[PDB]
Amino acid sequence: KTIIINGVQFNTDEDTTILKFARDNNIDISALCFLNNCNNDINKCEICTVEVEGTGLVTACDTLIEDGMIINTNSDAVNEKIKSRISQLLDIHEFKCGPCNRRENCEFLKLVIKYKARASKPFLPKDKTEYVDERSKSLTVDRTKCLLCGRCVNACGKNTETYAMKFLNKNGKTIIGAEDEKCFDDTNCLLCGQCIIACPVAALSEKSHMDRVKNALNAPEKHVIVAMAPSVRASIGELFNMGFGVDVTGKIYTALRQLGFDKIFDINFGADMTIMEEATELVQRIENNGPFPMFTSCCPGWVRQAENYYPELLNNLSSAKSPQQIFGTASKTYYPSISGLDPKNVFTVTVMPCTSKKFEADRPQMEKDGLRDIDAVITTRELAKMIKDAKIPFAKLEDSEADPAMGEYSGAGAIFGATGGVMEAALRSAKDFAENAELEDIEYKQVRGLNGIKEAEVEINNNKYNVAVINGASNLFKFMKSGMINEKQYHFIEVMACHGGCVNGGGQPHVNPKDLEKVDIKKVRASVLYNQDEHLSKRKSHENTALVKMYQNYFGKPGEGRAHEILHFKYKKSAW
């Protein structure tokens, strides 16, 4: 194939699109609605317009290169078309970047600046109320920003296969929204936030908890704990121009203290708690021969998936609370027992890579004696905004340490944020528990990485067991519908709704499509976690010294008695 682009001849056997070929050859072509290898098939944005001689204007993102093509990407006709399409979007776009939560990394703004586009008539609604949907505990929509680019809808379909995000005809006008324009929470939506991650503008956002947090911080009598997810320390630096794959754990603890939090703990401590309980449960089921399989229950996207699509599995989920909720439960019981705080005055905040966690935290029964396990959840992005609003020079901060009583963690805990991490951590403990031993071979590499469905055979106490790690909500549907679950007897199955695990969650920093071509975001964020594991002296959850003291002095033996009564949560299917 001979191809001419802007007068440059290429000879190639490649079978690909003009966009991808141009991009591979450092020729600039803009794009908007193209993402995840899909464009918006109905109502194409045409931002990737180029000129093919003899044919006219074509969309480079979905037009294959052909031998003999002569292509101009930067002709006056091309730029005028693209400029026109951007101007048309400005006509339906509340272009007020100042207070906008995507001000610093918005794709549309870059395009507006690049083509010097202007609205015919500026879009300036006075009553945004009709345009905004904040009903959800997790997601919010601001349709004054929406480009109808279809990226949320394609990403929902690809990532989850639920198609909970849809195009809708609302009184004759096209919008995106949930089925029947219901609140997302009241539909089959997993509240995973992959739609947000796909959004080029500030149209989709997380449901804010930042005022819950600020109010508690400013309330004189409130004692505000904060505790961040595994993934936050591998990710948040991205929003402070520190690049990718930077471990900023120490800087976060310092930042959190500068924001005025009263105690700095860590959700990885809660991940060790979850393993203590989950691994103990796994050994129990093995001894009662069932029910099998046991599924993890720590991902609320998956819990919602089970609730909405496989309620028959709800009884197979581990009764262990998730690291978030189990930590929170302890934060209102154990923590007062070792601090003297009145439990009513403890306000527990988590920092998560996740939008679904907001919903988990607000489940009615996720409380005891009137006290919420978790009072607020802020996403990685929300914490980055709080830090920037406070003029905290994050990239310049010195390292500090967590408060150890609910802040220590093992390397088992540290890897939770990657797909296969829970499985690996859980097996490090279950094997030790079952064989009553302290084994030295603790790396389960076969359950790691980005394959959609991963399985392994493991030997526990001289019997074989089958494990699977389901990596992404769409892969959970594949596993079930294809009958894979019936090819053999599965004993323990991990499910994460987000592909890559929590490091790719819905609350994470946006990465623009070009950086994504350049960096494997799932692997690079995950690598921070595995590195921590490798350098920690304690690499099993049950060797966490602070955790051991808590169980010895307060909860007693895992998986029974007081531990079972307050650290566990069971989901029930509705009756016939």
Ligand code: SF4
């Ligand atoms: S979505 Fe982007 S272009 Fe629109 S107001 Fe916000 S920052 Fe500006």
Ligand code: SF4
């Ligand atoms: S919400 Fe965002 S991703 Fe979805 S159509 Fe609107 S601008 Fe595109």
Ligand code: SF4
């Ligand atoms: S939160 Fe997840 S399941 Fe719900 S619409 Fe967005 S991508 Fe789809």
Ligand code: SF4
């Ligand atoms: S994989 Fe992690 S970030 Fe994604 S929905 Fe589940 S808990 Fe949330």
Ligand code: FES
């Ligand atoms: S980027 Fe090609 S039509 Fe939208």
Ligand SMILES: [Mg+2]
């Ligand atoms: Mg297409």
Ligand SMILES: [Mg+2]
């Ligand atoms: Mg305070």
